[PDB]
């Protein structure tokens, strides 16, 4: 009948517990040792300048008010005990719409070690913001950040730290790559301190370096542009007696280049500078227009 003794242990733990007070409120600064396991790097939405990422967000602090002494060493408790104790309020500084999964039960975990060391993991789907400088489109490379810190707890109260060597904290699964357009190169973590109007907060940062794949843009813009230019230069080998043929060549090539420019500019966000593909399409337009002008002069 271990159920009764373990119930008594749990009720002694929660007897006289205040979850509005962080562990070590008077004489200590709480130390939250975080960690991340990226189960799948979601598709980088280029239109919204966002990206999705599915993580196992792990945290672990030391609560001295949750020491016990029983037959077991680690209490692998249910996720509903995590709501009766104090848990840090980590928020993502750039997350847009994050969801915590509730299928079939809350995807959470809580292991109370016998010496008070807690462990609390969640399964999240963070939709963060990745500001992009599309000046080398489609040969660009980005560094999508993921900044998370504490809310309501300044640096004098809750300090964050990686749980392993900072190079080995953020781990990405091997098969976890939902990227069809980009190519994940590597992660890069860092820890800093941001000032504010309310206080000084600790901010942990993680950049995922990407590298766009040019195959699709080649196939659907650069080949049609080059082929249109060739089809336009075909109009020079026709004899000078066939005027309508060369006129059709010129006009249809100019129309094709116009529609190609339009369809090529639609894929990108409505950006207010010129990309590399834009320069290529402009030069091809100039070539076809010059071919038409040369025919007119002839």
């Amino acid at each position, epitope marked *: 009948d271990n159920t009764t003794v373990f119930t008594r242990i749990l009720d002694r733990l929660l007897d006289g517990y205040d979850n509005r007070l962080r562990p070590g409120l008077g004489e200590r600064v709480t130390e939250v040792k975080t960690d991340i396991f990226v189960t799948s790097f979601g598709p980088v939405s280029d239109h919204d300048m966002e990206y999705t990422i599915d993580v196992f967000f792990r945290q672990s602090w*030391k609560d001295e008010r949750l020491k016990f002494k029983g037959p077991m060493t680690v209490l692998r408790l249910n996720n509903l005990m995590a709501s009766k104790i104090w848990t840090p309020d980590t928020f993502f500084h750039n997350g847009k719409k994050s969801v915590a999964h509730n299928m079939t039960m809350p995807n959470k975990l809580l292991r109370i070690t016998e010496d008070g*060391t807690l462990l609390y993991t969640m399964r999240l789907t963070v939709r963060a913001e990745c500001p992009m400088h599309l000046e080398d489109f489609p040969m660009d490379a980005h560094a999508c950040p993921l900044k998370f810190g504490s809310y309501a707890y300044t640096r004098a109260e809750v300090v964050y*730290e990686w749980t392993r*060597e*900072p*190079a080995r904290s953020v781990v990405v699964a091997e098969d976890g790559s939902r990227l069809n357009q980009y190519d994940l190169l590597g992660q*890069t973590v*860092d820890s800093g301190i941001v000032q504010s109007s309310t206080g000084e907060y600790v901010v942990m940062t993680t950049h995922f370096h990407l590298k766009r794949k040019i195959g699709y843009f080649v196939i659907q813009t650069y080949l049609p542009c080059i082929m249109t230019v060739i089809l336009s230069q075909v109009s020079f080998w026709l004899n000078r007696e066939s005027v309508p043929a060369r006129t059709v060549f010129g006009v249809t090539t100019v129309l094709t280049m116009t529609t190609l420019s339009i369809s090529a500019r639609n894929s990108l966000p409505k950006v207010a500078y010129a990309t590399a593909m834009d320069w290529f399409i402009a030069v091809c337009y100039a070539f076809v227009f010059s071919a038409l002008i040369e025919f007119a002069t002839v």
Partner: antibody
């Protein structure tokens, strides 16, 4: 807060020395425990670390197999045992714990081992 | 393995003048570079944990300056007890220290 290492050792070449590092002022299960060597008038060098909560030990590639790092949670001690030693590793061995931003805030005092005949 | 090239090897400077030390990392180390001050016949003492954060008990004449790879330790009004080695060590990966700079008075 206060790390007490062992004393100096005078070991014959070809034997095994086991240096101890007793931590007083904290529990070793909370932090890591690094072992560093320093030959005379040279730079510091990393040997390996141990996570006393689990027992996961990592070593420098050039110290793999020669050294092993164990712990003792009852006495809050870290042990470094040099399995097979030549006459060249006559350095000073330090014991340190990781600090706030993964630095080594508290160092030991150094057990200067000596290999000769 | 990240290697830290610390410069210069040994400098000699008089009392009361500004001095600077450089530590260039090979790979990326975000701000996990620490500066230790080892006086002769003593154990190294942590000066700057992380880049530009003085440790408790360090005079305000020591300042760090961090980057991705290049790091700097500037001492201001240099006193007479600052004659010691100054090692720089990253911690972004498994810790690797620099060679150290023997500061001297002349």
């Amino acid at each position: 807060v206060q790390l007490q290492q062992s004393g100096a050792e005078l070991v014959k070449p070809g034997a095994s020395v086991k240096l101890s590092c007793t931590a007083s002022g904290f529990n070793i299960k909370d932090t890591y425990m690094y072992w560093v060597k320093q030959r005379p008038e040279q730079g510091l060098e990393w040997i390996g670390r141990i996570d006393p909560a689990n027992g996961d030990t990592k070593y420098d590639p050039k110290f793999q197999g020669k050294a092993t790092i164990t712990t003792d949670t009852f006495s809050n001690t870290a042990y470094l045992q040099l399995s097979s030693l030549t006459s060249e590793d006559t350095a000073v061995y330090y014991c340190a714990r990781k600090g706030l931003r993964w630095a080594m805030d508290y160092w030991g005092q150094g057990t200067s081992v000596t290999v000769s005949t | 393995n990240i290697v830290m090239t610390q410069s210069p090897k040994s400098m000699s400077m008089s009392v009361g003048e500004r001095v600077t030390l450089s530590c260039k990392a090979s790979e990326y180390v975000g701000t996990y570079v620490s500066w230790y001050q080892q006086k002769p016949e003593q154990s190294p003492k942590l000066l700057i944990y992380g880049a530009s954060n003085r440790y408790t008990g360090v005079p305000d004449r020591f300042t760090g300056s961090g980057s991705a790879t290049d790091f700097t330790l500037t001492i201001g009004s240099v006193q007479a007890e600052d004659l010691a080695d100054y090692h720089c060590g990253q911690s972004y990966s498994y810790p690797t220290f620099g060679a150290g700079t023997k500061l001297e008075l002349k």
